C-alpha cells in the first residue's frame, strides 16, 4: 500500500520491539543498583509502555545511567511512532480533501 501506511505499520512493529528490548535491557541495567525498582520483567514492560506514551506516573523509573539511556530511546521511539501515525492520518485527510475538490 501507500508509504504513510507502510511507515505507520513499520513504526508500530518497531515500537513493540523497542518496548520488549527496552524492558529486558532496563532490568539488566537496574539490578545491581540499591533501591532500583525497575528490576522484574513484567512491570518493566508496563514501565516501558507508560514511558513510550509519555504518561510517566512515577510508580517506576530508572536510577542508573544505562537504564536512563534505555529510557530515552523508549521515549523517542514512542514519540516518533505516534507522531508518524498522526503524520499518516494528516496525509490521508489532505489527499481526500484534494479529491473533494478535484
Amino acid at each position, epitope marked *: 500500500s501507500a508509504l504513510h501506511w507502510r511507515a505507520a505499520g513499520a513504526a508500530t512493529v518497531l515500537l513493540v520491539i523497542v518496548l520488549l528490548a527496552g524492558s529486558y535491557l532496563a*532490568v539488566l541495567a537496574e539490578r545491581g543498583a540499591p533501591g532500583a*525498582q525497575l528490576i522484574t520483567y513484567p512491570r518493566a514492560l508496563w514501565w516501558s509502555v507508560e514511558t513510550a506514551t509519555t504518561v510517566g506516573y512515577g510508580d517506576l523509573y530508572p536510577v542508573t545511567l544505562w537504564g536512563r539511556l534505555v529510557a530515552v530511546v523508549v521515549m523517542v521511539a514512542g514519540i516518533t511512532s505516534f507522531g508518524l501515525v498522526t503524520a499518516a492520518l494528516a496525509t490521508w485527510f489532505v489527499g481526500r480533501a484534494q479529491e473533494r475538490r478535484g
Partner: antibody
Amino acid sequence: QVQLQQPGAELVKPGASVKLSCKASGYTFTSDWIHWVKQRPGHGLEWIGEIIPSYGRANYNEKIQKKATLTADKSSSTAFMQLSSLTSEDSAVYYCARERGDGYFAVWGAGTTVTVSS
Amino acid sequence: DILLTQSPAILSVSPGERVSFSCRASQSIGTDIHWYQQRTNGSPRLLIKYASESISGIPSRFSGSGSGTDFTLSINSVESEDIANYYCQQSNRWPFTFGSGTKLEI
C-alpha cells in the same frame, strides 16, 4: 526431574579457593537468573549474588565482604561461583536457585556443603 | 536495602490450630513478598508468591495476606509435616533480601 544439580560437598583448606557449580535442566530461558544463597549451620538464608547466563552480567551482595565471583558456561547450562581466600566463617551450605526474572525462587538446588578446615 | 523482620523467632502451637507467621518490611513493598519453607536438612521450598498467590503442589492449608509493610503467612490446622523454618523474601527493590526466619513448634 531435578532442575538444579549441585555437588554435595567441598572441603577447602583455609586461604584456598573453590569453584561451585549449579547445572540446570528443565525449561531454560534467556531471561532466567541464577542466584546463590549462603546458609551457615543453625542460621538463616543469606543472598550472595546473581547472574544472567544469556548476558553474563553478575551482581553481588555489597553488604558483606565479597568472597564470590560469578560466571556462567552457556554450552553446559552450568553456573559457577568462585569463592576465594576462605576462613571458617565461609563454611556453610550454598544453594543455587532459579528466578524467572519475576522476583521469586521457583526452584532450588540441593545445596553444596562447604567445609573450611585443615 | 530492605530489612525484613520476622518476629517471634519461634511459634509453639497445638495440633489443628490456625497459625500466623509475621514478616515486616522496613519500607512499603506493595505485595512483592514471597514465602519459603525449609525443613531440617532440606532445601527451601516456595509456598506463597506475591503475598497471597498459591503455588501448585502446596497444601490448601497455606495462605498469605498483607500489603505495604506488614505480611502474614497462615496455616489452617497445623500438622507435624509443617514443622520447619519459614522465611519471607522481598523482590520490590534491589537487592532481594530475606527475613530472619521463624521456627514452627508443635
